[PDB]
Design a protein around this motif. Structure first.
Motif, PDB file in Angstrom:
ATOM      1  N   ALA A 218       0.829  -1.204   0.000  1.00  0.00           N
ATOM      2  CA  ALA A 218       0.000   0.000   0.000  1.00  0.00           C
ATOM      3  C   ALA A 218       0.870   1.265   0.000  1.00  0.00           C
ATOM      4  O   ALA A 218       0.549   2.263  -0.676  1.00  0.00           O
ATOM      5  CB  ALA A 218      -0.916   0.004   1.223  1.00  0.00           C
TER       6      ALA A 218
ATOM      7  N   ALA B 138       1.640   4.519  -2.864  1.00  0.00           N
ATOM      8  CA  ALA B 138       1.660   5.946  -2.554  1.00  0.00           C
ATOM      9  C   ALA B 138       3.007   6.588  -2.862  1.00  0.00           C
ATOM     10  O   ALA B 138       3.077   7.673  -3.427  1.00  0.00           O
ATOM     11  CB  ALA B 138       1.331   6.172  -1.084  1.00  0.00           C
TER      12      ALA B 138
ATOM     13  N   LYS C 128      -5.657  -2.292  -5.206  1.00  0.00           N
ATOM     14  CA  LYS C 128      -6.803  -1.596  -4.644  1.00  0.00           C
ATOM     15  C   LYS C 128      -6.399  -0.191  -4.213  1.00  0.00           C
ATOM     16  O   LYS C 128      -7.139   0.779  -4.432  1.00  0.00           O
ATOM     17  CB  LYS C 128      -7.354  -2.392  -3.456  1.00  0.00           C
ATOM     18  N   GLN C 129      -5.224  -0.095  -3.597  1.00  0.00           N
ATOM     19  CA  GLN C 129      -4.706   1.191  -3.150  1.00  0.00           C
ATOM     20  C   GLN C 129      -4.618   2.054  -4.398  1.00  0.00           C
ATOM     21  O   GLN C 129      -5.125   3.182  -4.422  1.00  0.00           O
ATOM     22  CB  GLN C 129      -3.329   1.021  -2.515  1.00  0.00           C
TER      23      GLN C 129
ATOM     24  N   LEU D 299      -7.955   3.224  -5.218  1.00  0.00           N
ATOM     25  CA  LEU D 299      -8.499   4.214  -4.292  1.00  0.00           C
ATOM     26  C   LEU D 299      -7.945   5.606  -4.632  1.00  0.00           C
ATOM     27  O   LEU D 299      -8.524   6.627  -4.261  1.00  0.00           O
ATOM     28  CB  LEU D 299      -8.142   3.880  -2.832  1.00  0.00           C
ATOM     29  N   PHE D 300      -6.819   5.644  -5.332  1.00  0.00           N
ATOM     30  CA  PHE D 300      -6.209   6.915  -5.705  1.00  0.00           C
ATOM     31  C   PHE D 300      -6.684   7.428  -7.057  1.00  0.00           C
ATOM     32  O   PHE D 300      -6.201   8.455  -7.523  1.00  0.00           O
ATOM     33  CB  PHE D 300      -4.689   6.787  -5.722  1.00  0.00           C
TER      34      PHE D 300
ATOM     35  N   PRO E 275     -11.497   4.131 -15.265  1.00  0.00           N
ATOM     36  CA  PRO E 275     -10.558   3.327 -14.477  1.00  0.00           C
ATOM     37  C   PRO E 275     -11.142   1.940 -14.259  1.00  0.00           C
ATOM     38  O   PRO E 275     -12.365   1.753 -14.313  1.00  0.00           O
ATOM     39  CB  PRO E 275     -10.487   4.094 -13.172  1.00  0.00           C
TER      40      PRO E 275
END
Lengths: 221, 210, 205, 217
Positions: free
Chosen positions: C59, C63, C86-87, C90-91, C126
């Motif tokens: 994760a 980032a 998934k991270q 989420l972005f 996306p």
């Protein structure tokens, strides 16, 4: 005197409060327990309901972090206690245990310290033994560093040395339901614990108290 | 002499093979390493060594590899763990001699460290058996030193701080390297020296028990 | 385009480099592998790809990689032997995870990674896709998750020393429901499952 | 009525016994908490038979169902922590509740974003009874604010996040980056987070997986 109390099981473990209440008899006690430079967060925490009150913090960090933080947050403290930990800290496990590490942390700072473990417990029946072990440790030349192991229902007290047995890597073949093969591995001690060792004192119903050193260095070698 | 080699980083770490290879100059080496107290299931499958070494990919901890290795590759006179970026302790606890090799960390240059692995292995082999040694190697050593474990460094410091979100916290940092004690592993590495610390698995303070 | 590539096994997993090289055929690839409010360390690490070793979770790699490698259009995690993909999702980015449930031969699999990537890159962005490949695939199937593959039974048993325990074992792949990731991989097909990060049962509302 | 209770924070957690004490006001309660092969050891708790399990929350549920045999409802919590929005698809508690449903029973997870379980007991009972009126089987995620003042049905909050990465150095000179996922939009009305942010209990009916069925038509 002022005592900081911590453990490695956490702020909600009953052993922690057993140790704190036992300590409150000898001094004002404070609690800091878990809930390379690294960050550490602590949060005030309420002590158990009908139990005596105790200023406390739940700490997002290790038992050792709890000690450094506790000494910083609770001003000058004279003694660090860790436990009563749930499980045992006997023989080889004392040198790779977080319970022993916090006490060591306390001693590294110049304070007397001790760890309490009980190989699995009824803290109502142990209260008096916690009290009596505590007044014994408090007669030692200071500062001291001791690992205390209590049997479920102790009938005495012995100064001990760590059991240093050798082991056998028992490895038997097996297979799980889905047929897949695998190997069972179960280390087994080569001999029953020797008289004078923590494990021997404990197996015989004696509270075991072992004086510790700070490291594993073989200076003789 | 026979040697079991393992490590913490797993079967695909270049560090493992560097050590396996250095150890082969000293004897017959079998390899068992991870693929990433009570009886517990442990899986192991033959693995193609990248010098050809018999090797197993082990789904378990470094301690698990030692136990399976002896089971799968018979007896060995020496258990080595590394080069890392339990095991040795496990080997020693079974009565064998052992050493752990670690490069405290840029990326290390194994070609460059091989002579150091050899030199260190020649020195350790001069020890009374069985021995348990912890070896730490600087990225570019300039020497060798027998050392003891650093303890003073952990009498650290607690500094307050705030994260970008303004939330408060405390830093717990060890003592600065410039402050390491001379015959300790920490002073030696920081100073560019390979560190070899002989270990005793007894945390007892006998001077307080006589 | 720009592809951030990470995995779950860490910087020395071959699966990671197989994925990086294959995705290098569709765009530029930057690697960030793992060897609120928290510190994370990352150091440059050495077909060549820029890369970072990250002392944090998958994760965290996402980032950090996004901060380090300017914008990116897609996040890929794998090939594997909060989830990164998934991270990534989420972005706001498109993302996919590659995993192979014996040692995998990434020479034989390369054409399959490529073939999958090809289909992935044609989807409306996306997207978030979980990709599972068999060891010797022979095809590609869009599938749904096999939830019934978690309903394993507990089987009593004893360890060599008479100490008891219970086996929690999954349901045999023979029971794989047709049309699910698990059925696909069992029948030798690459499985690609599109996900949505919403566990809400709308019908129940 | 039989009931298996478990959690994510372990057997010494007070959230756990609150949930269980509350559940016994509805049926015979059994507890299985955590601290391949799975191991469990009887543990002392009113008195509920109990086990401490060396395994995952899902393991406890699977293991718990095998022991305490025929159960009708699985509850997980009360967990000392929120379980809102994206948190629900990567949570042990929801995981446990999900395992019970997979086995065919009704299940629910209770969480409290932070707690006085004494001033919460009336709510746990009320919430529990509301759930019981639902059609069997059900699977619900329940979040209770520290101090509630109403209940309402919700859908999981679903929003985009930004990965705030700011460089910094430790007091020793070593470099690092701070990472903090920050939400762009505020929680939308009708979502679990929206509700709980205003002192309302949240109840979100859940589905078994994250497959995007719309993308498969």
């Amino acid at each position: 005197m002022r005592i900081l109390v911590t453990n490695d099981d956490g702020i909600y473990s009953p052993g922690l409060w057993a140790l704190a209440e036992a300590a409150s008899q000898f001094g004002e006690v404070f609690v800091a327990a878990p809930d390379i430079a690294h960050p550490v967060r602590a949060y005030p925490h309420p002590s158990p309901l009908h139990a005596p009150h105790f200023p406390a913090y739940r700490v997002r960090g290790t038992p050792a972090d709890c000690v450094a933080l506790g000494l910083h947050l609770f001003g000058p403290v004279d003694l660090v206690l860790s436990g009563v930990n749930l499980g045992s800290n006997l023989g080889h496990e004392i040198w790779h245990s977080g319970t022993v590490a916090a006490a060591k942390q306390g001693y590294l700072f110049g304070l007397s310290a001790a760890a309490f473990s009980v190989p699995l417990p009824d803290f109502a029946g142990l209260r008096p033994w916690l009290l009596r072990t505590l007044e014994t440790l408090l007669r030692l030349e200071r500062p001291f560093l001791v690992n205390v192991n209590l049997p479920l229902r102790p009938k005495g007290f012995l100064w001990t040395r760590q059991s240093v047995r050798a082991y056998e890597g028992v490895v038997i073949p097996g297979e799980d339901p889905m047929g897949r093969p695998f190997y069972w591995f179960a280390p087994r001690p080569l001999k029953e614990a020797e008289e004078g060792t923590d494990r021997w004192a404990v197996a015989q119903g004696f509270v075991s108290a072992t004086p510790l050193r700070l490291d594993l260095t073989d200076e003789t070698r």
